[PDB]
Ligand SMILES: CCCCCCCCCCCCCCCCCCCC
């Protein structure tokens with residue numbers, strides 16, 4: 001017997017599919033950076049795509065621990081081009097803030113149903129979103145200071161390209 | 165400048181998106197096995213999904229190494245249910261044979277255009293397809309001899325659950 | 329001076345005595361499994377009884393950290409017989425879900441009194457209950473698949489008998 | 493088949509439940525010492541409670557080794573307050589002597605029925621009772637010489653707090 | 657863009673400056689203990705002052721992670737004299753309970769604004785306050801038992817002087 | 821009994837409170853650099869704040885070693901903004917020179933009273949002031965040659981960010 005409501009399971013299943021798309025979106029930003037010849041930025045996006053997949057698998061395993069199951073949905077085509085390095089990272093920031101709000105909505109839904117197990121499970125993602133948003137804001141701050149100077153952009157490519 | 169033809173670049177890009185779907189499909193088989201309580205089969209499918217992503221990334225890096233670009237397309241919703249363990253693996257074998265034929269078509273297209281670089285690049289996937297088809301046929305052979313006997317299915321669940 | 333209300337201290341003290349009974353109940357399930365000759369199942373219940381005691385001691389130490397004290401109450405006689413292996417584990421699942429709801433009630437009580445210290449303390453038990461319930465559901469799932477086949481039941485006895 | 497008489501099995505089962513109460517009683521002395529702020533005495537009582545559980549489990553495994561069954565009974569509420577450290581240890585000594593007499597009664601019952609296996613099994617508890625009574629008498633002797641001097645009680649709190 | 661409200665940023669910034677004062681206050685208690693010749697008590701207060709600074713830096717880093725900034729305010733002169741060892745530690749306890757309530761107020765403010773990121777961030781401080789208050793209550797309990805006996809006070813000076 | 825004059829004790833106590841402000845001021849420069857996104861400069865200022873606290877504690881222990889007492893005074897609100905990286909370091913140099921002159925005044929006061937112990941104690945701070953002034957002048961010299969070029973400022977941010 002499923003011990004989460006179907007309304008909470010659907011919210012969790014929806015967020016899992018959102019994490020899959022986020023991973024797909026970051027891979028598509030990698031295709032853009034690789035097309036532009038920035039292999040450090042592309043490498044950063046490829047690792048970010050891997051991290052989003054581990055987010056989805058965390059939702060995956062919790063759903064089965066509460067007696068639910070996962071249904072994978074179609075993944076819509078992400079954008080493949082941006083008007084520059086900062087335009088892509090600004091799109092990344094806007095996306096992460098959207099993901100954070102989507103997590104907030106599940107937390108409030110589970111809270112009103114007094115599903116404390118799901119409320120507590122989501123705490124890790126609330127904290128992780130703070131990290132993810134901040135990491136993009138820091139990059140955007142460095143790009144603003146670079147102001148297109150390729151000497152500085154080359155260093156940030158090699159630096160972000162060292163992400164493990 | 166791109167040194168692969170647009171017809172070969174499109175064929176390679178199509179196969180990348182096909183490998184992405186293949187990984188997605190195997191994750192959906194994992195969701196089915198986990199729903200049925202077979203965590204060894206589900207683990208095998210999760211590792212199979214990871215292996216398909218590496219195939220997709222190998223097409224990715226070859227496309228850029230030939231001066232082309234990757235465009236990610238929408239991913240279709242895979243089925244989420246199968247009529248038992250054997251039915252799922254029968255679907256996996258039929259799928260792998262479809263992937264092998266899709267690789268053959270790129271090889272023949274590249275060979276017609278005298279694109280020897282792409283022809284030689286595709287040899288690794290031809291050999292890998294031989295291995296992945298045999299892996300599923302071996303599993304299917306043991307399931308046929310098992311004839312649904314749960315004593316045997318349990319041993320094969322935990323064995324497949326040991327895949328690294 | 330006690331910095332938890334007497335109403336929250338009583339709720340915590342009641343839960344401590346509930347954990348003691350749960351440990352006693354699991355020991356009594358061990359006496360049943362040992363009487364039936366399943367020393368792996370009995371071993372699993374003996375370790376589960378030890379784990380419930382560490383739960384009680386966690387409530388014990390928090391009560392004294394908030395300036396309260398513990399009063400041990402009488403422990404009612406647990407049942408000593410079940411109608412089979414699955415009947416016992418189903419009784420275990422129903423008990424764990426009852427314990428989870430009892431934890432939920434303390435969390436809601438402490439929340440209305442705005443006792444955030446107790447609310448946060450209970451998060452560990454909310455998460456632990458997810459683990460405990462899931463572990464029993466997994467065992468019940470394997471017993472359903474076993475369908476009384478002693479070849480399979482022997483393996484699950486030796487497997488659960490390896491719990492450390 | 494059971495190779496101990498029902499009269500010896502009942503006597504052994506009664507002692508198991510008595511050992512369970514003894515462990516419960518020592519936990520209640522821990523709750524008293526912790527309420528009084530003596531964390532070394534409380535630690536000693538917590539370790540003493542763990543040792544009594546091992547005694548109970550030794551009766552447990554002997555009963556099943558003779559083909560009998562264990563039935564857990566209700567546990568009485570122990571006292572939760574004592575008139576100081578010395579009063580608690582005086583209650584502990586009186587309790588241990590009661591446990592020793594209860595062991596003697598089983599030994600004499602088993603010896604009357606010529607149950608040499610149970611007679612020999614009980615020798616370990618006779619010797620252990622000599623040790624546990626002496627441990628409490630030694631503590632009581634130092635408390636009498638201490639005459640309530642807090643300088644001495646502090647040193648004996650931290651010494652007893654080092655029990656492993 | 658700051659993603660915390662200015663009302664939450666101000667509350668967090670106010671608490672940071674409160675932690676700075678708490679560190680200053682504990683250093684001033686050290687000046688009192690050193691003036692009284694108790695170098696173990698003073699050492700304990702100096703380490704407590706260091707721990708309060710790490711609390712302030714935790715608020716510091718979270719504010720910048722949410723897009724806010726820190727503004728340091730003037731630090732009011734703390735008291736420099738107490739009427740005895742217990743009077744100082746009782747002042748420490750009253751201060752820690754005041755800090756805990758100030759943390760509670762931020763948690764409730766962030767909760768009403770549905771700022772779950774800040775709510776979750778404050779959980780660490782809620783738990784830490786339980787530790788801090790308890791550590792002072794334990795010391796006050798030992799001082800009450802000492803009742804001014806310098807033989808016992810000397811040991812608690814050397815003991816607290818060993819805090820690492 | 822105090823073996824330093826009250827006029828030297830007050831001068832030493834005044835300098836302790838000045839060192840406390842100096843550490844507070846450098847923390848405020850850290851809040852400014854972090855607000856501007858320069859985490860290497862901010863890290864350097866945080867380490868500089870820690871070093872000033874050790875200076876304050878050295879005055880602390882000398883005052884008690886001469887039989888005096890420390891009285892902590894209110895700490896003024898430092899400025900929280902500067903007109904860029906260079907402006908902040910220019911303020912730091914002007915501040916360090918003020919600290920050096922304040923040390924000189926104590927040395928001359930102690931020398932007038934023939935307090936050779938305090939004169940000799942202050943030699944360490946005279947030499948240390950030479951080092952801290954030179955550290956800021958060296959940074960200012962590189963900032964002048966940098967002339968705002970962000971390629972150079974980035975390298976000096978990460979270099980100063982490596983200070984331990
Ligand atoms: C150099 C590192 C490259 C990492 C590439 C990662 C690309 C992931 C793109 C998203 C794919 C989504 C659909 C498939 C999901 C499969 C999940 C498997 C989990 C075990």
Ligand SMILES: CCCCCCCCCCCCCCCCCCCC
Nearest residue numbers: 351352355374377515516538541542
């Ligand atoms: C082989 C492992 C056997 C473990 C047996 C554990 C049995 C526990 C049964 C419950 C007892 C409850 C009453 C006594 C509680 C004592 C708690 C001591 C805590 C330090």
Ligand SMILES: CCCCCCCCCCCCCCCCCCCC
Nearest residue numbers: 679680683702705843844866869870
């Ligand atoms: C023997 C250990 C002595 C430790 C003394 C600590 C004294 C701290 C007193 C409070 C100071 C507040 C104002 C300055 C804050 C600087 C914070 C720097 C953080 C990196």
